[PDB]
Write a structure and sequence with these properties.
Chain A: Belongs to the complex I 75 kDa subunit family. This is part of a larger assembly, with chains A, B, C and D. Chain A is built from six helices and nine strands; from the N terminus they run ββαβββααβαββαβα. By secondary structure, chain A is α+β, with helices and mostly antiparallel strands. Chain C is of the alpha/beta class. Chain C has a single domain, classed as Rossmann fold (3-Layer(aba) Sandwich). Chain C has six helices and six strands; from the N terminus they run ββααβαβαβαβα. Chain C has a three-stranded antiparallel sheet, with no helix packed on it. Chains in contact: A-B, A-D, B-C, B-D, C-D. The interface between B and C is large, with 63 and 45 residues. The structure holds 1,2-Distearoyl-sn-glycerophosphoethanolamine, iron/sulfur cluster (5 copies) and FE2/S2 (inorganic) cluster. 1,2-Distearoyl-sn-glycerophosphoethanolamine binds next to α1 of chain D.
């Protein structure tokens, strides 16, 4: 398949969506709800690009790159001004209720939400009203729970139920009061519950064992091991 | 279109002249944020291109800079020729008020370039440094030895595979190098230093060392003397090498600012200004007017500080030991204001990407007014007591004189260039940081640059800086001290302390670093001692891929042998006093 | 508590010999001639302390000898560059007893911000240091404070009165750390002036 | 030299001597350290301290932003937690033999815990004693910023500050609540 991103030609797989095709090409599109192993659901609305009908089209429309096939002869723009404004607005809407928590948050320096907030260029707060707040749950000895930091991207429930076939994690409530966790306090029963700390793009689900002796990612000495 | 926008400068007449002379396929034009036309030239055509540029109707007369780049780890080289290494040549046409950068691509195995020394004599030390730090050989160089590192040094430190950090100390190698110092005079041969015809059996070779510390630093000069007369001398430098450019590859864009402060340690915010301007070009930041006025005021205060030290130390070197006490009292008044504003004396590290660290504290205008009332009577007293003394005049007038052609061929800038009658100050020719909104004059000489004319030109520069400071005091704009850009590093502190998106931006900017998109930027300023420039290459990361600092003191110290030949040693020490250099500037 | 250079020993100190030792220590600590040696920006702050606005001459320490033989104090005021380290060692070896060393600034203390290929990480890697000054640069009165600290250290050391009679070992007092001495007053600080003013 | 040059030179020598004598008749510009204390402006970058909130608790949440913002790398600390969940440094050490007093750590601190204070007198006899641990840094009050409290802004619950009790925070609404 042939796509044209910002006037540049690219050869991609037509069976892929535009988000994974553009990320495979090295282009940067902000995203939350999509994961490579979980598929596309189009929830967070972060991955907006401007799609044009043809080469001689200047109006276009905003589409979700994760929900749009990377079909042959597809004309899109990432750096379009309206697309950039909408992506910044999505980050801003996520920022309205987000707690002032980065210094005391185990995700800091390793946080996809921090990276996408910086990537969209959103650094000025004009929202002045109250932030919604949630109580936390005890999830056992491995996973720490902090629902204030949730951006309702649904990655956790999609991984835990649709991928890992777990039964004791879910989404509750409605509108801006959606809650992600167990129906009651208790240990997460899945043998693969620990992947939530990397699946969750925020600091809702964090490594409790690491949190005991916490340090930031830049301070780590890493090695590839088995 | 903003001033930081990426341009190819194809509308420059030099591009059309090169296309008409060499053909369209002879060179590749690179689009940069350097503000100059960047032209990739084949290695076999470099001397032809340089000669053509030197023989233009309004010619390129000065080799501003010459250095190298290790391009092996550079991932964003779109539109660039294939290159493991590269060598760049920054040339300036003062008559055109234009400049051009020429880039020569080199493969890893074939690391040799023809020498530029026949076209420009300052290419000698520039090519010696490029050989020392990169391992790039220059064919036809008269003596291509290491200039920063000692001669028994292994490796080339600016290469990407050379480790930046300090190696483990060993007393054995210190003992060995002490032995080399002890038998250096016993086994001295003029041939390895570029000297010749010595020991005729009438000349002597005499080494100068760290015995006259007039705040310039430690370096050596070996003099070939016919009795009392200098027939040849080479400076031995690199005793103040700090690896500052390598540190530029080692620190984030924000955390490198204190290192910029210590390049020319009498300059402070003057040193900070070209770096933050070049970073702001990389970030696409246009600072507001209050930032421009604050940065100009800090730069002029530090220029007066540096000029006071320079004039007083020149007077002390001539022999009059009194005015240094009073001039350092004036430096303390400047330090009162600078301490109040920035919190520090000599290395404020106060400029920021997108602005300055804090707003001006309440009551700064009182201290500025006190200094502006204190200074002129003291300056007139120094003039009458020392600079109009005929013994000082007889020690300085006509000593180490050079004209416009010698200044142009050696890259001399600042007061040494303007004493030859060439009106070239960056604050007027290529205005920056809102300097075009200030009323000030550029003092120029009569055509001949002695020690005395350089010192008096710096006195007039001090008076003009006082005028600029008066304008800064009278018209300080109301507004922000930081730009409203997302890459302003750090963000305003109060919003960081109460707004989550601002806190996120601050968190990532101070820890991982601000992400500068892949580009090349350049900023040239009129520093205290001449023209200082930063050339920054970003590979899209939070650290500089390459930080090249052009300093004027390097060029002036290279000009030393041409200007002092045929003079006495007393003329040499007076000349060193009148150059206005520090060894940190020379060695970086 | 004392350290002996010929180990941790006690105080070796007749009452006339104690008075002579005190007189020699008083004369040495009140007449300290620094060596005029400039490495980097810290030396600019040192010679600033020599000028009229600070007047280090008041302590009798302004003479500033150009020869290491006439100097009692080496101030390493600046970075110990690798090329300059043999020069520093040779100049220190050329100094005569008694000699004291003040490491001035972060570079001379530890290498400072220059953990880099061409810089020795602190002058105490190869020459002994009597007083360390943190700062980059230390302000001139910090150099004067270190001079006074050196004076206190000199005023209670034990050195031979003559090289022909008596113990020839050099005893240096194990002084209390300035951090531990000032901890009581420093921790008790509650409020400081806000940085929005002059 | 000519006779006119000699006479003019003698006149300039006389003028220099006269001006320096009149300087001897002038007022001393010496700041008399240590008897006269050095005036330091409020934002002077000297000895680093760690400060306390207005409630008396230490402000440092061990977020490690100062240590990574340090270009010298002379700050080392480790996070620890109380039973109520308050983050704090288990240890906090600063190598002042390395520190360049640049103020980047204070600039990077999101709680205003770490502060450079107007105190320059920091000379030491042994270099090991220039390593300041937490007991040598933590002071009894707020320092230069008298009122800021990070934990009044953070969404994380601690002792005395439950969920919904921070600034601009609504009370938590249970998903089981009857209101639509
Ligand atoms: C007994 C105890 C007391 C002893 C006293 C000893 C001193 C001699 C008597 C008093 C002399 C007073 C001199 C007054 C000088 C006034 C200062 C002055 O303005 O000098 C500068 C002036 C030239 O001004 P301008 O050209 O602008 O200089 C700046 C550029 N360089 O310069 C001039 O205009 C020069 C004016 C003439 C100066 C000489 C006057 C006659 C001297 C006769 C004796 C010879 C002295 C020298 C002999 C040397 C031989 C080795
Ligand atoms: S989840 Fe990310 S953005 Fe939110 S508080 Fe934690 S580090 Fe900050
Ligand atoms: S808890 Fe994490 S993974 Fe789940 S919806 Fe919220 S932000 Fe997404
Ligand atoms: S400690 Fe700082 S001021 Fe002193 S020599 Fe080093 S860089 Fe210069
Ligand atoms: S003042 Fe600078 S060098 Fe010192 S601890 Fe803070 S960041 Fe590090
Ligand atoms: S930046 Fe401030 S709160 Fe964070 S670890 Fe350092 S002193 Fe503590
Ligand atoms: S990643 Fe496409 S809408 Fe969420």
């Amino acid at each position: 398949a042939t796509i044209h991103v910002d006037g540049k030609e690219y050869e991609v797989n037509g069976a892929d969506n535009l988000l994974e095709a553009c990320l495979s090409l090295g282009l940067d599109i902000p995203y939350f709800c999509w994961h490579p192993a979980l598929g596309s659901v189009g929830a967070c609305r972060q991955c907006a690009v401007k799609q044009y009908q043809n080469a001689e089209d200047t109006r276009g429309r905003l589409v979700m790159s994760c929900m749009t096939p990377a079909s042959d002869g597809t004309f899109i723009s990432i750096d379009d001004e309206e697309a950039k404004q909408f992506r910044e607005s999505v980050v801003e809407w996520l920022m309205t209720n987000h707690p002032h928590d980065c210094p005391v948050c185990e995700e800091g320096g390793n946080c996809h939400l921090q990276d996408m907030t910086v990537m969209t260029g959103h650094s000025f707060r004009r929202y002045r009203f109250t932030k919604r707040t949630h109580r936390n749950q005890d999830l056992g000895p491995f996973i720490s729970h902090e629902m204030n930091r949730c951006i309702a991207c649904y990655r956790c429930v999609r991984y835990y139920k649709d991928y890992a076939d777990g039964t004791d994690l879910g989404v509750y409530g409605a509108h801006d009061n959606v809650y992600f966790g167990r129906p009651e306090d208790g240990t997460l029963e899945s043998e693969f519950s620990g992947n939530l700390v990397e699946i969750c793009p925020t600091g809702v689900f964090t490594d409790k064992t690491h949190s005991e002796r916490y340090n930031r990612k830049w301070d780590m000495q890493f090695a590839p091991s088995i | 279109e903003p001033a930081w926008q990426t341009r190819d400068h194809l509308d420059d007449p030099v591009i059309g002249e090169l296309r008409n002379r060499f053909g369209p396929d002879a060179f590749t034009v690179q689009a940069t944020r350097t503000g100059v036309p960047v032209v990739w030239i084949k290695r076999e055509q470099l001397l032809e291109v340089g000669d053509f540029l030197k023989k233009l109707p309004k010619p390129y007369v000065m080799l501003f800079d010459l250095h190298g780049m290790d391009e092996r780890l550079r991932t964003h080289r779109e539109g660039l020729p294939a290159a493991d290494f590269s060598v760049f040549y920054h040339l300036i046409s003062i008559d055109r008020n234009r400049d051009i950068m020429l880039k020569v691509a080199l493969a890893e195995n074939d690391l040799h370039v023809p020498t530029f020394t026949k076209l420009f004599p300052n290419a000698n030390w520039y090519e010696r440094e490029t050989w020392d730090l990169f391992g790039i050989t220059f064919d036809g160089h008269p003596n291509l030895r290491r200039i920063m590192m000692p001669q028994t040094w292994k490796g080339h430190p600016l290469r990407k595979d050379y480790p930046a950090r300090a190696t483990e100390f060993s007393p054995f190698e210190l003992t060995k190098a002490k032995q080399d110092l002890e038998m250096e005079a016993l086994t001295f041969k003029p041939e390895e230093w570029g000297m010749k015809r010595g020991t005729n059996e009438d000349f002597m070779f005499l080494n100068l060392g760290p015995n006259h510390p007039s705040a310039h630093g430690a370096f050596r000069i070996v003099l070939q003397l016919d009795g009392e007369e200098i027939v040849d001398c080479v400076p031995d430098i690199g005793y103040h090498h700090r690896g500052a450019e390598k540190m530029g590859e080692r620190q984030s864009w924000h955390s490198y600012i204190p290192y910029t402060d210590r390049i020319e340690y009498l300059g402070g915010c003057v040193n900070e200004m070209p770096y933050v301007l070049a970073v702001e070009k990389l970030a696409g930041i246009t600072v507001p007017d209050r930032v421009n006025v604050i940065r100009v005021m800090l730069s002029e205060l530090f220029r007066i500080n540096s000029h006071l030290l320079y004039i007083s130390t020149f007077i002390q070197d001539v022999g009059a030991m009194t005015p240094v006490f009073f001039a350092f009292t004036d430096r303390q008044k400047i330090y009162d204001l600078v301490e109040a504003i920035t919190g520090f004396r000599m290395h404020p590290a106060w400029f920021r990407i997108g602005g300055v660290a804090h707003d001006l504290p309440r009551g700064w205008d009182r201290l500025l007014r006190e200094f502006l009332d204190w200074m002129p009577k003291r300056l007139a007293s120094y003039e009458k007591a020392a600079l109009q003394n005929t013994i000082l005049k007889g020690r300085s007038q006509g000593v180490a004189a050079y004209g416009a052609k010698e200044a142009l061929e050696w890259g001399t800038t600042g007061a040494g260039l303007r004493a030859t009658g060439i009106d070239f100050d960056v604050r007027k020719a290529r205005p920056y940081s809102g300097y075009e909104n200030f009323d000030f004059e550029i003092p120029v000489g009569g055509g001949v640059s002695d020690c005395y004319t350089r010192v008096m030109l710096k006195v007039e520069e001090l008076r003009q800086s006082l005028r600029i400071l008066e304008q800064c005091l009278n018209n300080m704009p109301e507004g922000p001290f930081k730009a409203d850009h997302p890459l302003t590093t750090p963000p305003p502190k109060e919003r960081t302390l109460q707004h989550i998106e601002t806190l996120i931006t601050h968190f990532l900017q101070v820890s991982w670093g601000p992400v500068m998109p892949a580009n090349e930027s350049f900023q040239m300023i009129e520093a205290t001692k001449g023209i200082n420039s930063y050339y920054l290459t970003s590979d899209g990361s939070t650290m500089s891929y390459r930080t090249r600092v052009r300093t004027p003191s390097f060029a002036h110290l290279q000009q030393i042998p041409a200007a002092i030949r045929g003079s006495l040693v007393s003329d040499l020490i007076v000349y060193l006093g009148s150059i206005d250099f520090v060894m940190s500037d020379v060695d970086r | 508590d004392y350290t002996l250079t010929r180990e941790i020993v006690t105080d070796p100190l007749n009452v006339f010999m104690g008075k002579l030792n005190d007189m020699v220590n008083w004369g040495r600590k009140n007449s300290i001639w620094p060596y005029n040696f400039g490495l980097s920006c810290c030396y600019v702050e040192m010679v600033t302390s020599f000028t009229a606005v600070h007047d280090v001459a008041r302590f009798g320490a302004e003479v500033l000898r150009a020869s290491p033989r006439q100097a009692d104090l080496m101030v390493v005021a600046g970075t110990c560059f690798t090329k300059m380290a043999p020069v520093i060692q040779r100049l220190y070896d050329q100094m005569l007893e008694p000699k004291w060393v003040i490491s001035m600034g972060a570079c001379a203390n530890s290498g400072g911000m220059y953990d880099i290929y061409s810089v020795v990480q602190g002058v105490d890697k190869f020459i002994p240091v009597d007083v360390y000054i943190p700062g980059c640069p230390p302000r001139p009165e910090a150099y004067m404070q270190a001079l006074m600290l050196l004076q206190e250290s000199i005023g209670k050391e034990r050195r031979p009165l003559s090289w022909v009679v008596g113990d020839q070992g050099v005893y240096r007092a194990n002084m209390q750390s300035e951090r531990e001495r000032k901890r009581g007053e420093r921790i008790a600080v509650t409020n400081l002036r806000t940085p929005d003013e002059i | 030299m000519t006779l006119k040059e000699l006479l003019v030179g003698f006149g300039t020598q006389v003028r220099s001597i006269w001006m320096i004598g009149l300087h001897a008749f002038a007022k001393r510009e010496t700041r008399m350290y240590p008897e006269e204390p050095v005036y330091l402006p409020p934002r002077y970058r000297g000895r680093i301290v760690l400060t306390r909130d207005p409630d008396g608790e230490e402000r440092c949440v061990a977020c490690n932003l100062c240590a990574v913002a340090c270009p010298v790398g002379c700050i080392s600390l480790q996070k620890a937690e109380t039973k109520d969940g308050r983050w704090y440094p288990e240890f906090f050490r600063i190598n002042f033999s390395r520190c360049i007093f640049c103020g980047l750590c204070e600039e990077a601190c999101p709680t205003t815990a770490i502060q450079l204070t107007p105190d320059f007198e920091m000379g030491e006899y042994k270099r090991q004693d220039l390593v300041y641990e937490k007991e040598d840094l933590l002071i009894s009050g707020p320092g230069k910023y008298p009122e800021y409290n990070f934990y009044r802004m953070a969404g994380m619950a601690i002792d005395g500050k439950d969920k919904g009790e921070a600034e601009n925070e609504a009370k938590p609404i249970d998903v089981k609540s009857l209101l639509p």
